[PDB]
Amino acid sequence: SDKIPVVKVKMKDPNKGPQIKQWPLTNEKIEALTEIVERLEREGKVKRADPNNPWNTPVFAIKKKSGKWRMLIDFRELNKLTEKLGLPHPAGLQIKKQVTVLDIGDAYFTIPLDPDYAPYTAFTLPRKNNAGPGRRFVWCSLPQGWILSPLIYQSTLDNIIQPFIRQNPQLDIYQYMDDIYIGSNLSKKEHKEKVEELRKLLLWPEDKLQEETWTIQQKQLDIPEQPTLNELQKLAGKINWASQAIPDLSIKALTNMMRGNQNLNSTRQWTKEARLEVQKAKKAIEEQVQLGYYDPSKELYAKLSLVGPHQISYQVYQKDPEKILWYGKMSRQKKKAENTCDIALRACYKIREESIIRIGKEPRYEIPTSREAWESNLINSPYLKAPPPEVEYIHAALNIKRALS
Amino acid sequence: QIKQWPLTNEKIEALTEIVERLEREGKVKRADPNNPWNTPVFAIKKKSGKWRMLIDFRELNKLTEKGAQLGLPHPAGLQIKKQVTVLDIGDAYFTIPLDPDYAPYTAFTLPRKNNAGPGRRFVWCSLPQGWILSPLIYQSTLDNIIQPFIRQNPQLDIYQYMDDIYIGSNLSKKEHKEKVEELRKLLLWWGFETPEDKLQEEPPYTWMGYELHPLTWTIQQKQLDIPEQPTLNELQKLAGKINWASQAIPDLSIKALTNMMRGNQNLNSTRQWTKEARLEVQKAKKAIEEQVQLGYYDPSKELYAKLSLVGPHQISYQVYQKDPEKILWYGKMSRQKKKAENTCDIALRACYKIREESIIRIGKEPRYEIPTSREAWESNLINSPYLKAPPPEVEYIHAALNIKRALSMIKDAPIPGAETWYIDGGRKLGKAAKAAYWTDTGKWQVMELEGSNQKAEIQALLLALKAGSEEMNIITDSQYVINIILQQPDMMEGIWQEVLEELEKKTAIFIDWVPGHKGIPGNEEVDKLC
């Protein structure tokens, strides 16, 4: 059940495609998964692969609430290597009274895919304990989580969708990977109404954010009244760190205010030149966070740190001129079991929603872990809601830990 | 691609007969005059028979374009069955015709009296030749032939490895036999014949170089033989046997023996035993002999992984079940010579490896038993978190040795009353580098040692401490040393080992960091090293 023009699609090199090995899956996940895939080869949305096909892409499954299982595909590697329109990111979306987000996903099943490119969408289905070779599969529908599907979808339903935006221009509509973002300032009633209308439009209201309650975290530089030598060496290192990207900061006056007996327990009394220099740095750092400094031509980054136990702090920011765009916490939550990698995943998803609502894109996530600890916490975990964040592995550095706290 | 190797005159007398006996039945033909490629043909004499002609095909198995059989089925993942059959699909590639547009790269020259004339070139037409690259032609087509039978019969446990099918069931002998005949029928209807003489059906089973018994499996082929003039063929067979035994036993390395394999890929050429890759082969030799036996997984029982500890640079573990104490498999996690890991961290890494293996083989995660107090685990390496960690929720056992907390550092609130130190090193003029320390009390000294700037900056450390009290405050301008200290290692290499070795003696250290080269009180005077 699909006939509509095939948006033809090209690799950045037909020779260089995704060769990624499949994750280990539980008994339960293989059961649910082979059920899903077998059904979708009945309906024709998937088909068996060519015996000389060298590509693969990982698949996994999650327990969508109600226990009904769901198949997700990690298209991270393929997405980089293809990139062959749109409905653009509305500036007003981030200042709407409410913004409902809706999964489409299913409509993709009704849309064909370029069969000269589908060979690269291949994914292996494994069996428990390698009892047989994996059963390989290439795609026939628009695959969910694919990079070029929001385009091929939006251009395929262009003729029915853009009517509904030129009418009702009080709504700000956007689409990221497979989710549609409906933002409005109407009352809860008529908002629910129009979102219902648009749901039945793509039949051819689950999650709802209110991005005002999103604070700014308002970083602070604590200044003790009766300091010790060590409290001021921390103070010094921290401000020397700030001066690497903030102009007109100095640690000289307090540098020689720290002169005397050199036991870390020795006190100092506050001079006036150093106390004022300290104040200059303090108000220089509080006001540092500025989203208005975003540069759409540079890469966007989000860096995480474990600021003591049970709590991740992150900064979404940009490089060569280091400009912090916003900050954020994510505290381990009480009842459920949770390791630090899980708080990092949760944080990554919170960053994902914020960044999509404001910039319209996702940052690169810089996480202080190893490829082995991460990527083993995801293969068999709960807390995994979406395709995994694309991750850069960084070394823990004390200046950044002290900065984000 | 490759040049036909020298071949003993009494091998072609007996290999031309196999090649001629093969072009007669048609499995080969003559290549083309223009066929530029080649592959060597070797001849080994199987004990008490005729000469088995074995072709390499290792070179071209890379230019014959790629594909994508995701590991091995592990016999501990089989469960105990009242009835077991092992079908062998003989006629492996032997009659099954081969793609003619890939058929040219099949070329192999053959000697007459080793160049009494020019070489007789041949090309494999009918068979894929019993080569190694059956998994392409074999596994995914067999899998789709028998997958309907698999879905039809959930009461059976089927396992397809290269040319063995394994069928395990709890039906009676008669119903089981009938079903095995059902699948044999299905196989013949698609071309795959199962000869009655290679069937197993009987008390011990050969299966991927394992031996399956009712309660127990073990490594096939209970004796490793070390030849004193090792040709590379015999060596490769030794690496295969070792790799099979490596699924049951841990800690069996192939690396010095694979290093001992090198260029001159002739499988009747030889090597000479390097010293390390004889100790590997002898260690594996005694491990394999005096056999071990392991169990099958019991889905009706809790699964366990127990970490045991001896030596500070290795964590051993067993995946096993309880109340007969059935052991499913063993494994090791070794220390990293460069990294700043302590033993808690090696335990964590072992948990990662176990989680992977268990999920592949069993389909679930075991309960983790580790020898440590809840204190030395919840605090160490999950609450002193340089970098982050995915532990499970865990059962702590008390064993012969346990994992203890890393170090004696007291993080918050630098120690009241002990004298602060300051310390620095490096500043390479030329070869000359130095190291030194100063304290709030007058004490001070310079070392003026050899090394690099980094080793000079750690060698700076250990001299505040060798010359220090039992309590301390160290402050340094090195991000390297402060970083390692924040990972909390409990054993390292080199001079770092000695600094770790002085942290033995002391009761309370507090180390901290301040920016170097900003003229900070304390750092500045110790910078005077040049």
Residue numbers in the entry:
A (entry chain B): 2 to 85, 91 to 210, 216 to 223, 237 to 429
B (entry chain A): 20 to 87, 90 to 551
Study authors write:
Reverse transcriptase (RT) is the most common target for anti-AIDS drugs being the enzyme that catalyzes the central step in the HIV-1 replication cycle converting the viral RNA genome into DNA for subsequent integration into the host genome. RT is a heterodimeric protein of two subunits, p51 and p66, encoded by the p66 template and, therefore, identical in sequence except for lacking the C-terminal RNase-H domain in p51 as a result of proteolytic processing. The structure of p51 is rigid and provides structural support to the more flexible p66 subunit that undergoes functionally crucial conformational rearrangements. FIV closely parallels HIV-1 in its replication and pathogenicity however is resistant to all non-nucleoside inhibitors of HIV-1 RT.
To elucidate the mechanisms employed by fRT and promote our general understanding of NNRTI-resistance, we determined the 2.94 Å crystal structure of fRT. With 48% identity and 67% similarity, the fold of feline RT is conserved with the HIV-1 RT. The p51/p66 heterodimeric enzyme embraces the famous “right-hand” shape of p66, which superimposes on the “closed” form of unliganded HIV-1 RT (~ 2 Å RMSD). The fRT NNBP structure is conserved with HIV-1 with variances around the NNBP of fRT making no global change to the pocket size or shape. Intriguingly, a group of FIV variances clusters at the rim of the NNBP entryway. fRT is altered to K101Q, D192N, D177Q and V179D in the p66 subunit, and E28N, T139G, E138A, I135K and S134R, in the p51. Structural analysis suggests that variances at the fRT entryway could render a rigid pocket with a more of a “closed” conformation that could inhibit NNRTI binding. Particularly, Y181, which must flip upwards to open the NNBP, appears to be trapped by interactions with the conserved N136p51 and potentially with I135Kp51. The bulkier side chain of S134Rp51 may further contribute to a tighter entryway by filling more space at the p51/p66 interface and interacting (3.6 Å) with the carbonyl oxygen of I180. fRT also forms three additional bonds around the entryway: one salt bridge (K173R/T39Ep51) and two hydrogen bonds (K166N/K49Rp51, and backbone amine of Q182 with carbonyl oxygen of E138Ap51). Consequently, the pocket entrance of FIV p66 is constricted by ~ 2 Å as compared to that of HIV-1. FIV variances, especially at the p51 loop (S134R, I135K, E138A and T139G), have also altered the electrostatic properties around the entryway from negative to positive charges, which may interfere with initial drug channeling into the entrance and subsequent penetration and binding.
